[PDB]
Design a protein around this ligand. Sequence first.
Ligand code: SF4
Ligand code: SF4
Ligand SMILES: [Ca+2]
Ligand SMILES: [Ca+2]
Ligand SMILES: [Ca+2]
Ligand SMILES: [Cl-]
Lengths: 630, 354
Amino acid sequence: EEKAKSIDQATLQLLDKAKQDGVETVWDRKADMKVQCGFGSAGVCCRNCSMGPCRVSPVPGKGVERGICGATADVIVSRNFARMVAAGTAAHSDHGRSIALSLYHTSKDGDIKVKDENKLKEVAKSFNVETEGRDIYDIAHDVAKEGLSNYGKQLGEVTLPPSLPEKRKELWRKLGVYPRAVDREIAAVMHSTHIGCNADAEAMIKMSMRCSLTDGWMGSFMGTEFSDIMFGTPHSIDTEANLGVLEKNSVNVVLHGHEPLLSEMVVEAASDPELVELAKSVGADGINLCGMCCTGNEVSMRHGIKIAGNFMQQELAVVTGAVDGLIVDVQCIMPALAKLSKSYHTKFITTSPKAHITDSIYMEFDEENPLDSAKKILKEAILNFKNRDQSKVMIPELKCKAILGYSVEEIINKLDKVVNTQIGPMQTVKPLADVLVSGVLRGAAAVVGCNNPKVVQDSAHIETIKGLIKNDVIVVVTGCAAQAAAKYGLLQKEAAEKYAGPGLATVCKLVDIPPVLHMGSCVDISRILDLVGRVANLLGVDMSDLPVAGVAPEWMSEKAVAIGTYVVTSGIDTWLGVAPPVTGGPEVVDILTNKMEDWVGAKFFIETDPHKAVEQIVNRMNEKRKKLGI
Amino acid sequence: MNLFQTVFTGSKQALAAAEGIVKQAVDEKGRDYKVAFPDTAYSLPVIFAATGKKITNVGELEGALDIVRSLIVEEEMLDKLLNSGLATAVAAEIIEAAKYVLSDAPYAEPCVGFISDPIIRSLGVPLVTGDIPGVAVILGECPDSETAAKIIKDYQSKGLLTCLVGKVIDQAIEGKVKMGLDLRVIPLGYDVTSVIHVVTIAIRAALIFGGIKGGQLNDILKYTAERVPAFVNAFGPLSELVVSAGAGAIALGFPVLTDQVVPEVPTLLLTQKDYDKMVKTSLEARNIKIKITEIPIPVSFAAAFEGERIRKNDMLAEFGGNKTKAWELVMCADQGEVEDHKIEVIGPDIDTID
Ligand code: SF4
Ligand code: SF4
Ligand SMILES: [Ca+2]
Ligand SMILES: [Ca+2]
Ligand SMILES: [Ca+2]
Ligand SMILES: [Cl-]
């Protein structure tokens, strides 16, 4: 009768417990919202000044046509869209900015240090920083200074990655969307969306495209590249996923958020002899560290830390009654966790001055003394195990194995296994390019995205991934979408025979990989751009000429909008499972889902049905294959 | 055009060719004329492996054309290419079967054509023990006869069986190669379809040694892929028909390596332009590890030169026989009598001969 809440049995079990406990969840608050405002849902409501609030008609020819200022529905909708990109870009901007500042404070006998010297030497080449006969920390600081300039330089040209084809750069230049400093483009969009500024849908949407580029090729890239320098480049690693990872007799410390420095220090803190003994003093087996959302992906990729769950599972993790400490930093942390943690012994600890949540324990993460600060927070979670009500604990016995760490460096290393020593070249993406041109693999898709109560949890993610791998399309995943697959069991070597098509199953067996490749967090989507870029450069074509696609089956965050925008602007078609608020703007719908193709060689596709989406992705990929002659 | 349409084109060409020669047999010999290969208990091996049915007359050979048609499904998915490659193989067998119908002696020397079942049994034991590490299927034309002979003589030196089809037969003759079943170098034929008789060696090996029954195509293709150490070496320009045959070889699990630029497929279809590396690439591509002994001698040393017929005219020196006194012996002695590597040639040497 009522639509299912989720496809995961562990999620469905804890949802029943939440009802019996009397607590409210995101699914319950969705029902409370009832019918959602159509004006806001169509994007035709404007609040960019105090002359309104204005609400024009989404159906042209009837109702109120213009806003008080004169803005038409297309103007209102295009500005509303722009601001989402600018907000999404800002979330990834501060993320990478913080990583770069950490790189600037690295020392040989310090809490934060350079782990991957080889990666730093390569990154230093792109930023024009010398490496010959110099201290790795002196290079790291000069690189950090050059990287930080990309955020607010007002003169000169910005440094872009080598994987970005020159054809794509020239296309942006001629279109007028070449990126500038990161914070500069955010201000540019915010200024033009102000009352009495831009009133042209095409120009506004182009401003968002320019802004979104500073996220994917600058904010996220540097965030990913510098994280690999300081914490290590990820490689194929095993781990367990789903809420079944929590242990009843151990202290459970769940890390949620996005910033990787705090989670890297809580991992090291879990290995301090004093803290391991304090856990035993309280009556625990040990310290069971778990992750959720990006911060969890960033730790499972590098240290194989177990994943508790994705975005909409964050409330149900507390409902298990086994989370002693829930340490959060920034982004995608539902404020409900403060009210929910009151009904349990769980301690909700906020650490970033960027994300303060009312009625929550606030323990600021001292970046000057990071390891000491991490130990102080972890100690509080350990001591809280004393207040655990073991009789009311209920951790569903449902976990799944998964393989991740599939960075571009790791994928290239694995592809070397299928290269002949006497013929083929080494450490290049050629094996992947060869399989795509031949036609063994119909194409390569990137399923990324969040969880939305408008879609059954994980339903569209699994249906979409399944359908693509069945049609010989290798799938790469990141963020909550990657976790959704890890929970189902698609991130396993044995998933190739079970779900992959004829060609993909052959490639999986030869290269020895699962049919779905976990490439990391949403910031790690820059690795997908890097991979697709290398394939394009190796074949001497632009990214728009390859049979590639991006999918966001379930998405909410303004970050997903910026991600989609920079993916389409980079030349990769993107399918959206959740419809953005553009319905009321006919010109905006035409631009996003049609005219855009003429500007960047790619377009948006809105499809809520995942079965129809895979049909469209395959047909579109084939169209691009026929044009290229492959 | 892409690899898929190139395979589908050559397979359709192979069907058209088989349709033409089959009509010639119907019109000249009638639908009741008996069709059979020289000494074989599996009728037409490829058709018998795929369908498990034996073809005995021209009328039944006409019906086998529908097997070629059914295997060609023009859809761009790996399983369809491989089936299209097998359609080329079934068509090649139909063409080769009709060749024996319309001619008393279809093959001329040095070509062998169809390989008899006892020969398959003869090569079965040395394949298992590893005496024959691989079967090099060389097809096409080399830039010159010097390169063709160097590659054959190198494979023969490794003891790998080398089967030639196309102009490489004429090039090997000019480049002075020693051909013969015992010499491990067998020329099948000049036509492209002649490559089917090696494919039948691998299929019959699965039926004979593997003990697989006719009709179990998936099990026969597994045996050839895991047990028959075969690979193809296509030289010179590749036609659409040849690329379809390459897909058929890939269907049996045999990698195809060529000197021409083609859409490569890792560990399946590779491109080596350096002829001085071809042998090493081919062995690596089919996991063939050669246990080299490295004896310091100026002449070759391999199982292919066993049972050599050194006759009077081609001979320089003779020892033993009803001609002169000759003997051999192995003795057991202490470490004092034996001085490890020590070669003492008491008496005259072959240089003294005139
Ligand atoms: S402010 Fe706009 S979107 Fe919100 S309820 Fe009012 S008309 Fe709807
Ligand atoms: S900018 Fe225009 S449409 Fe927006 S609230 Fe003001 S008057 Fe209304
Ligand atoms: Ca960079
Ligand atoms: Ca592993
Ligand atoms: Ca602190
Ligand atoms: Cl590369």
